[PDB]
Design a binder for this molecule. Structure first.
Ligand SMILES: Cc1cc2nc3c(=O)[nH]c(=O)nc-3n(C[C@H](O)[C@H](O)[C@H](O)COP(=O)(O)OP(=O)(O)OC[C@H]3O[C@@H](n4cnc5c(N)ncnc54)[C@H](O)[C@@H]3O)c2cc1C
Ligand SMILES: Cc1cc2nc3c(=O)[nH]c(=O)nc-3n(C[C@H](O)[C@H](O)[C@H](O)COP(=O)(O)OP(=O)(O)OC[C@H]3O[C@@H](n4cnc5c(N)ncnc54)[C@H](O)[C@@H]3O)c2cc1C
Ligand SMILES: Cc1cc2nc3c(=O)[nH]c(=O)nc-3n(C[C@H](O)[C@H](O)[C@H](O)COP(=O)(O)OP(=O)(O)OC[C@H]3O[C@@H](n4cnc5c(N)ncnc54)[C@H](O)[C@@H]3O)c2cc1C
Ligand SMILES: Cc1cc2nc3c(=O)[nH]c(=O)nc-3n(C[C@H](O)[C@H](O)[C@H](O)COP(=O)(O)OP(=O)(O)OC[C@H]3O[C@@H](n4cnc5c(N)ncnc54)[C@H](O)[C@@H]3O)c2cc1C
Ligand SMILES: NCCC[C@H](N)C(=O)O
Ligand SMILES: NCCC[C@H](N)C(=O)O
Ligand SMILES: NCCC[C@H](N)C(=O)O
Lengths: 451, 451, 451, 451
């Protein structure tokens, strides 16, 4: 329909970069997009291109591909794509992507605000490919190291970012004034579960479970631990994927509970509300996160809850005896022990009540969420630049971490993205404010240059 | 279509009754209905009629008539009427009521499980009228007094129930072996608000607000305190009822939140789950009530939340300046003081944040819920019959309160209904289990007689 | 929960029956149920049992088992079950069935008026089994023959009904004063299609297609002709059932169109509207059937249309080239020729526009509806009893066919059920008015006896 | 948020224009917008401005303001605004309008594709105001007259457009090579109804009914003739607007029927389908319009049908006697005579069945649709330029009417918009394809200039 906008120019890796971004998921992608738009005279009247590079450990752009369950839907309006809430005229809107694919009229006839996760990933992939010249894939960042252009001074004014090539194992280094860490989360596992190849986090569902359970027709016993959106999607999907299997949903809560996207509550995810949340005290922020927990954690989309309920009711129609059901839910349970050294294909899972019985399974899917602390390890050698006494990174409103002013130049800095819920609200790890935040980040990072 | 079933026979008030029920709301009505069905040879094979009387302070049957807001809907499936979950063959089902009115086919074409509150009240009224011979209306019960058929013994074996005729003020007494107290709740007011005729509880909305604000066209300022279903219904309704008024919703929470009727959670209201809840410890029961709070308290029907949100959005369309809106919501506020002695028509309401500004209004609707402690006052003179040391009534699973066995005959007793959430679960004060509980109560109370 | 009501007594087959019913599908079942209720003193105050028998060719009760597609839903509110609109107190209501199965509370939490076809069939099966003593299964009726108790007179006053035992092939005869023919429809095939085992009517989908296509993993090509509810259900289901197959929906219309159950239109299915429809002239009845055609024929449930549309859109997401899609719709087409004598597994289907290209397929499902003329063949030897000149059976309002009064006794007669759309409206072949019609039929047939 | 794009320059009215557009409703507005975008180097790489003027008879931009009923909703996805389907990057998209108003995030939380008609009008108004320099309001075009730059030749190469200033009555003339007529429809009245100020077309509902019925509290009798979307909206609205009135919906059909926007059917409104429709024969086009009639004419939005049905059911709850209802529907009726010369405030409306009774009313709203023939009158003096024998204007695919090539220069022409259903399909008079058609029109009209 139209031509794609001009590509960003790559930078030789031996040159000092203006910005180096760790990760090229949605959060980094939104920053690339906002930078493109900011450098677009059509979009910004005022609009040399900044020297920028993105390091991504995956071999190409992918969005949670381990959980790309068939049928899985976005839990957010497509209007909250990577550009529209910042500038609906952007070439990087979902609607413009659809138009470019010749699909916009057909999507309109769906009357849905919620694309398949598959389609939304391809949207983001389609955006991502327009930045290929400035993204280095298959590069896993392993550390950020402070640098001094004047080694005999006591002022840091750049950082060296070292990454391991995931194919060759070789170590590269790139130097930059500013670093963004946007690396999402790491799998959270209950500390009571032993390491076993049959015990698999939800994040590796689509990738590593079919490797373990190769025959989709075989009568497997498969359990799912958890009662959030991932637990539900996996529990529901196993029933299609392995149709002769016996599945068990194990949860410490009494029920799957619906996610709250009711319109007054949902305004906590508005981009303008980040100022409001950020400015509250630590205590009020903690109470606020708790009060709105049903919008984000340990909750399932009502539609999916209802579909699973109907499936269970259909089992009840066929057999009033719940102990005989092919697919069962076991609420208010916790796993107290996992026998997993026996000769059998199966582990023995021992269960008790979760208030203050055994299953034998071929695999246990563990849908217990994510931690967002992995940036700490990347930043270990830059900790000493923090103000005296700090043992945590303190991100400012504009997401730049606080550093000792007498140790670090004002031209140099490190920003965090996607790990700042404590300071910036429940929207921080989601897609909800990426469009606007990208804009804010470009302004924060490239502000002098673009003025 | 069919004839109504045989009426129950009245009892002369000077005779010793088998059962005397205080209140003829839904809970008592469900007991009348279950008794009728139990005495129906068509419904119960095994089926002299028990001597029974109901005392109701209203002049005729009415169901929360002060909150019969136009458009107001049931928040419960009609299948949970006063008989169906006990016996769908009962003549007292909602569907059979519709058939009797010649309306069943038209209701079917609505495709709704949720009747207007108006229609459901008329259903219950239609049931209630079939018990007119055994209900004494306009009788307000004021005390229950222990009696001894042998005054020189130390055993109580009946109770005298005294009521005040609401029209004549005259005091009547009726004697009975067994008493049921089913009197619902009393208005809960925040203790910080002064008594004023302009400050009116939600329960008296339809009755006493139009008496105060007589001219529906006048530009009143009207506030609503609270963020539950009643606050919402009243806030929304005032906008139709007084179209030129300026309304303000004052709430200490940050948002109206949706009621949870998602299907797995909603099973806590199943009749069979009362056994389960009752048998849990006090501590587990407390934690359970807390965990499922969003099913019952401080929550609004999503549909109503969404309609109010749309109304506010339409105001935003007309004027981006929220300070100028005719109808406004003020979240995270508490009332710190109410000036109400000035010469003006209006009170001055002083507001502060509810985290750890003034309105001038013609009336303040206070939608802050109910207490369920009024039975305590009726039972003051029977307290001494409790086991030594008890300062609260302890209802058994079958809702009969515990009494000292050496002080009270096994043929005599007092049952509580609708005030037992602490011991019987969130369904206790609702319509949810009335059909089944009525059956259980008839069995508990009339069990010997019906065997 | 309760006990089942008393069984009806069987009749020795050599005795003259009061009523003999051909078929024990829903329509006959509704008559059995209404008769039971009419003989129930609990339900009818006024209430020797009539001598009745039902002849059904299937070996046991089954409801369209060839189209019991997984997930398939009722297209009618459960309130229009086989008794409720006549008498909601009946033991044969859907809700009472649920209660008897201990499932009523769980069904309530579905919040649906539309059961799975599987569940509704089991409801009807559960009803049907209560009449086992008076139903002879595996009996295919082949003719109805006039009888004269006085052979030398010219008055017919009974009929002999002869049936072929489907297992033994043996012929039985039973004599009766009154006959009901309630045998539903026969498969309508386009006259241009040749007989071939690979060409299968929708009615035999679940039974005879898996016999033909034994391996569910094989890449079959399967076509579906038609664009009604059956075509849609089969088209959608093949995609799950044979996941590697290539399916093609062939339709002469341009689109699947949604069924109209909007509430004002839907009142044509009200039981009371049959009087209104019946009394209109032939011309007005014809125009009326045409005007409301979108309620009944060549239409699909919006929900199913939307799901199929989403599946096609998902194919579009993966591949913009519709010619490469696994599952395709070909609108405005007609089949002009079917090569089916070649050596290949597959038939060659030749297509042209349907306005005034070839597929090779392993099977063609033909979803082109039903005829309702099979009663004509059963009644061939009784035609001469019609009034002079009639070449069609003329059913009165009460569904008794017109006969020459001087040739047939007033105590003898034949009623038609389910084939009377022309005279009684679009509800005649559906479940919509079975409850009320059953009552009317019992009154019409057994009226003298029950007075 | 961003600045508005550059304004188009006005043209002195004594200059020969490139394009003169009659009407500035949605269709003309979409052409203005597409022209702006085509001249935008940001949107079109290749991008002297054409000399253009729009003549609109209203004093300012308004969209069907006589039917801007409170609550009225768009019946089309906002994605089908005036630019998005052509170019989602356009500054004239609905989403960009929302962003400019600071409302985009709040609209997102509505989760609706269907704005209030009020909001969508303000969207279009907001677009329209950006073309104020080239629109002359209060100008009613009365004729288009052929011109010859060489009067002694036989070739027309311009047209003079004459308009009457609606305030001063003065006549202006403007000359142009090309003319677009985009003037929408004129009120269709049944020819059997007499002229009376109490008989008012739906198009003048919000403007001229409250002038007639000044007191909203008065017990008026008001009838509505028709059963389409307008009849329904007016019938429903009168009940709020005049709460003590008795309203009557008079319709020749038996029921309000729902509009078909089911997704396969709805593809007839796709912009790409205009090529397909246009190329079909006259006969096939006629049959096609008939087949899809339920998408466009004599149909009501299911949601509105359902709301009206619920209102009627609520009347039934209060009173089983339909003859006493405040608001009544009278189906299958036609008006045979209107007494309207009597002394009373009210007309007497005589009714009969519509198959092949009197009301006395204060006003009759006539909701019987529109004609689209008014361009004929404007073009009367240019008819002779058509090819010999034509008595109708024949619009080409690109909407330019056919003219004799030897009588009219190739640089001169007349285009029709919004009146071409017969040749271009059911989307022609709607908003459905305005975005794309605007683009096509700009290309058709300004094609040489923009190359
Ligand atoms: C199954 C699932 C469904 C979800 N659905 C939604 C939804 O519908 N709507 C919504 O708003 N949110 C949703 N989320 C939330 C999700 O967090 C955000 O949508 C989004 O993924 C966050 O973007 P991100 O860039 O911050 O993190 P990520 O998406 O995790 O991307 C971070 C990137 O950094 C790479 N990376 C990590 N470490 C390194 C390293 N050391 N070196 C180099 N590269 C590295 C990773 O490969 C990854 O690509 C969902 C999450 C999950 C798990
Ligand atoms: C606005 C509102 C809407 C509601 N909607 C629902 C719903 O949709 N679904 C649901 O399940 N629940 C609903 N509820 C909950 C409600 O508590 C129950 O539906 C029902 O009213 C409880 O019945 P009850 O008999 O226990 O109490 P009540 O309904 O309050 O009846 C008690 C009766 O006792 C009488 N009484 C009180 N004191 C005396 C006395 N001293 N002497 C004599 N008579 C006395 C009273 O006049 C009253 O009639 C709603 C409550 C409110 C306030
Ligand atoms: C797939 C499908 C789905 C449908 N879904 C609905 C719905 O959701 N709601 C609705 O209202 N309607 C629905 N219908 C319409 C259907 O016609 C009625 O629901 C119902 O089946 C009609 O009952 P019936 O007894 O008249 O005919 P049938 O159901 O066809 O029963 C007639 C019986 O007579 C037996 N029989 C036939 N010939 C003989 C013979 N010579 N001798 C002895 N026995 C014989 C047959 O075995 C059969 O059991 C559906 C139809 C189909 C095909
Ligand atoms: C109540 C109502 C609701 C509708 N809702 C929708 C909807 O939700 N979605 C949809 O797709 N369609 C809808 N429509 C269809 C409607 O036709 C189109 O939306 C749109 O109005 C068509 O634009 P138009 O410019 O062709 O005609 P119009 O909107 O009628 O505009 C034509 C303009 O020309 C002016 N004009 C007329 N004659 C002259 C003259 N001689 N000289 C100068 N100016 C003149 C008129 O003042 C008018 O402004 C609706 C129609 C009505 C009546
Ligand atoms: N899990 C995603 C939550 C997104 C949030 N409801 C929003 O509207 O932004
Ligand atoms: N507020 C009424 C709650 C009723 C409960 N959801 C139930 O289904 O019983
Ligand atoms: N009445 C408006 C019809 C619009 C059409 N359904 C469309 O989607 O374009």
């Amino acid at each position: 329909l139209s031509l794609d906008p001009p590509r960003l120019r790559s930078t030789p890796q031996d040159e000092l970069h203006d910005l180096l971004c760790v990760g090229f998921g949605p959060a980094s992608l939104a920053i690339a997009i906002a930078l493109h738009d900011a450098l677009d005279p059509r979009l910004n009247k005022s609009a040399a291109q900044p020297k920028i590079c993105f390091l991504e450990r995956q071999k190409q752009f992918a969005w949670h591909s381990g959980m790309l369950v068939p049928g899985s839907k976005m839990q957010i309006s497509f209007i909250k794509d990577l550009a529209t809430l910042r500038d609906p005229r952007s070439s990087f809107t979902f609607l413009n992507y659809l138009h470019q694919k010749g699909r916009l009229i057909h999507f309109t006839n769906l009357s849905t605000f919620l694309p398949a996760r598959l389609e939304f990933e391809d949207y983001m992939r389609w955006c991502a490919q327009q930045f290929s010249d400035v993204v280095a894939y298959g590069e896993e960042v392993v550390e950020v190291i402070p640098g001094k252009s004047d080694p005999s001074s006591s002022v840091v004014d750049f950082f060296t970012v070292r990454s391991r090539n995931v194919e060759t194992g070789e170590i590269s280094a790139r130097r930059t004034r500013k670093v963004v860490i946007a690396i999402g989360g790491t799998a959270k596992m209950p500390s009571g579960l032993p390491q076993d190849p049959r015990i698999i986090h939800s994040s590796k569902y689509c990738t590593t479970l079919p490797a373990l359970l190769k025959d989709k027709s075989k009568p497997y016993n498969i359990a799912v631990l958890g009662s959030g959106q991932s637990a539900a999607e996996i529990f529901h999907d196993l029933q299609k994927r392995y149709p002769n299997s016996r599945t068990t949903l194990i949860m410490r809560d009494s029920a799957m509970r619906p996610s709250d996207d009711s319109p007054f509550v949902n305004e906590i995810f508005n981009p303008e509300r980040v100022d409001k949340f950020y400015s509250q005290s630590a205590a009020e922020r903690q109470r606020s996160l708790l009060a709105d927990k049903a919008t984000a954690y340990s909750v399932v989309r009502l539609e999916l809850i209802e579909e699973i309920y109907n499936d269970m009711y259909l089992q009840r129609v066929k057999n009033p005896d719940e102990t005989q059901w092919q697919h069962r839910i076991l609420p208010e349970r916790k796993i107290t022990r996992v026998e997993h050294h026996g000769p059998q294909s199966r582990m023995r899972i021992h269960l008790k009540s979760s208030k203050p019985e055994t299953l034998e399974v071929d695999a246990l899917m563990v849908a217990t969420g994510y931690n967002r602390n992995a940036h700490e390890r990347l930043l270990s050698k830059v900790q000493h630049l923090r103000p005296t006494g700090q043992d945590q990174w303190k991100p400012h409103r504009d997401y730049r971490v606080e550093m000792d002013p007498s140790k670090v130049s004002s031209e140099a800095g490190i920003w965090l993205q996607g790990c700042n819920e404590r300071t910036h609200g429940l929207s921080d790890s989601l897609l909800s404010v990426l469009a606007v935040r990208g804009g804010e980040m470009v302004q924060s990072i490239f502000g002098e240059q673009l003025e």
